[PDB]
Amino acid sequence: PIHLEIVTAERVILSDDVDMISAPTKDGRVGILPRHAPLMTILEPGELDIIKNGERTPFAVSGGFMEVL
């Protein structure tokens, strides 16, 4: 029950509710659940997966940031 606001400097990519997400963090991949604690994250070039209701969509990112509320 957390809305994933994947936004890029040019355009918004995704603003839908997602029940499961991974994150290519610089100190190990982190899977965030809709109850996760607040977090700040730096992403190296990797591969984020969106698993909303068992979606399992690969999504290649080349670095960035992540704020988990």
């Binding site: 899977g31 965030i32 659940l33 809709p34 109850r35 996760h36 604690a37 977090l39």
Partner: protein
Amino acid sequence: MEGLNLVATALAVGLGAIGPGVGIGIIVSGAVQAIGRNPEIENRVVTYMFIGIAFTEALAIFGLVIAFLIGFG
């Protein structure tokens, strides 16, 4: 010596409750730190925690059983 029995029972209990206690504490601390982040895994890790807790108790209870095997022959 005539008094070596009860001491052995004590050495069965006291030495048997050192490591299991530390293991229980470390297990609960790890489960608590893993429940602070992503509490939606709150079931699964706790289930694994239960697995872990049983193992720790197993070792402890082994000593207790041995203690009784020394306590009453």
